[PDB]
Amino acid sequence: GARVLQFTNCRILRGGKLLREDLWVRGGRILDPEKLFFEERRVADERRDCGGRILAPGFIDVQINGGFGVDFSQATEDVGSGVALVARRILSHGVTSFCPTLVTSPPEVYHKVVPQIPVKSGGPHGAGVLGLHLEGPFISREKRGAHPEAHLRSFEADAFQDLLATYGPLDNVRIVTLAPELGRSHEVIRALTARGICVSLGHSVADLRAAEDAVWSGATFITHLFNAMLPFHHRDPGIVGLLTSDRLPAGRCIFYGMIADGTHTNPAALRIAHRAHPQGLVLVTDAIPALGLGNGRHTLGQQEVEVDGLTAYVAGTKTLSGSIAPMDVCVRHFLQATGCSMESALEAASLHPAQLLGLEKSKGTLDFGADADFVVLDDSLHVQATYISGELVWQADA
Amino acid sequence: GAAGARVLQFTNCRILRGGKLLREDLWVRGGRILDPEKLFFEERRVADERRDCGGRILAPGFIDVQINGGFGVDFSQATEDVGSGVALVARRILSHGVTSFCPTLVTSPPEVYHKVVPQIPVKSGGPHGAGVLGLHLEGPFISREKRGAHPEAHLRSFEADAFQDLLATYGPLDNVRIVTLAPELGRSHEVIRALTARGICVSLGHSVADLRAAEDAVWSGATFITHLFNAMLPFHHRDPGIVGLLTSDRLPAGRCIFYGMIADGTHTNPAALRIAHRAHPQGLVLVTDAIPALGLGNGRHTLGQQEVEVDGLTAYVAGTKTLSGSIAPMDVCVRHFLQATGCSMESALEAASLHPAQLLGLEKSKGTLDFGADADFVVLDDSLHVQATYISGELVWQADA
Ligand SMILES: N[C@@H]1[C@@H](O)[C@H](O)[C@@H](COP(=O)(O)O)O[C@@H]1O
Ligand SMILES: N[C@@H]1[C@@H](O)[C@H](O)[C@@H](COP(=O)(O)O)O[C@@H]1O
């Protein structure tokens, strides 16, 4: 663990620019070479030539419901094995941290599954688990999307105590998506953020003012913008209006997820959001359990999903269930659709989600002191290799 | 001639030049802006007259490409003296900072066009009022589903004989500068080509067209969008519609698509002005879309074949909650655009002048304070209230003070 690694002949993403600069690593952390040189030595124990390729912080996916046959919203015999399988497979997508996401389920499912998915550091076993993202059940009936109507719930009884009874202990929970128009959402948002949980707005028929109120109550994220929310209207902007709002707490950057799989939103939607509020854009996969399996029928929590073509509908409906697009595919599609810089596309998949979760000192950057989680990319942003804590954990067949 | 004409120098002023407010004098001769360094170099001449501007802002005079009348005048009426109504509006809008405009006619029966269109030719600006750049004919070749305030009974389509139907409806087009149409109408391609071949700007509006149909119309020659967001399908993330033109990457290279916005605080909320301005700032054109009741306050009035009731600060088609147009003068729109978007003063001023000038290919003579341009400009205080209006270097309106 004490070895000094030096990555040379590389362009690194630092401060929003690709710099021709070496990356120094020891004990899983990025090192300041000026400080290393003065205090210790100048010669690394190992040099690795990167052939001019790009090193960028490892991707962070804060919304993924499963994959490769695994459905996080199922109380199976070995919940942990399913999480570890997905965590391992998404290394090949450039993902080094993620939030396993559960969808609207009966309380007993939460009680069995939630304690089985704790935080875990990344390594050769797979991407690190940052905590659970619980999407629903405290969401709107009118914008339930693929969530089962039977298991939706409201707050009005006794607000946060109803949420605690539904989910069970929240120690392992990092994010909760809710619809803020629900009665007593204010109390719930306050109680959740007081416990360090990120509150996201989604699956909601709330208007702009209600959404702005929820941000003042503590909300900091929007769940897959444009999907499962009222559209933008010029005399009724809705939640999309948060991207241009000047009525939020001063200095606060509202973050918002976008599914850039080429099916959930057209290029115009990616462009208009990126141009209105670039700093807040967070790429998420919202991947469903059928990710990586091709066509067929599989599950998503309590619902059944029909995948045919590159599109996943709730069976018997034309309601999209989620994406089958890996994160690296989303990064490239975002880049192509918006014409943004490579730096901007890479930041939306790593820096921005890290900032959302308050992790920007340890994840999402190649800054001094941060964890050495990074991907090796060619100029087309195809992932050649994935590193966690300075250790090679995935390498492309080529 | 240059040798014989007087040199006027405006001093103690900030001027809008190259997108920046510069503490720099404005020099004028023969009605056009001159380079002082070159004048001294080639002629060793200084100003024959200096005018101290008290530290105020000089900006190119506003250009309003969509105004249906004002102060009781309705351009879409075949009245006894159509020209007198145009001159009245042209004079009054000098106090709004407007030095050029396009009188706009709404969906009307052919007989109205045949009588009115020939009575409203281009006319240079002066003490008589803002210059008339030509007519803007909005409708009748627009969709029924997004007709907005236009009367259903007088809508028309192209399918019969395309451009010859348009020519028979409007009459001779010599005086016409802009036509708004809905591009999903059958045979719109042929009409767009024939209109642009005659130098007429084609605008897209009052339409249920989708993005690809809108992009096709730009490839055929269309260069404007009529009051973005109003009377068109809303933006959807899997169906962008006409708003999607603001972010399209498949339009002709190097050419800017322009779009009008009514920044009166009633037609669109601040988020809509912000999202458009951030997506495509260079294309934004402020238009008043002013109705004949502009400057009259509440009451009942006309808009072509329709009746309009102004109540509160809102002008509805009588008996409906359908907005007919605005009662906001251009300078009011400029100040509201500035406030609602938080943009720079320069950006607000450019949206009311530079951009409409570029739309109409007039950027070398209007909409700028560049050397060689016409000396049409407004004197503004720091809040962008109009204190005085100049045309061809001559003072043509001044605030009471
Ligand atoms: N996970 C969400 C679904 O819940 C939603 O149904 C779908 C389509 O949303 P929309 O039709 O509102 O764009 O997007 C995502 O997949
Ligand atoms: N001149 C147009 C009207 O024709 C239209 O009805 C109005 C409202 O349009 P919308 O309700 O689609 O925003 O905008 C402008 O006023």
Ligand SMILES: [Zn+2]
């Ligand atoms: Zn969702």
Ligand SMILES: [Zn+2]
């Ligand atoms: Zn109109």
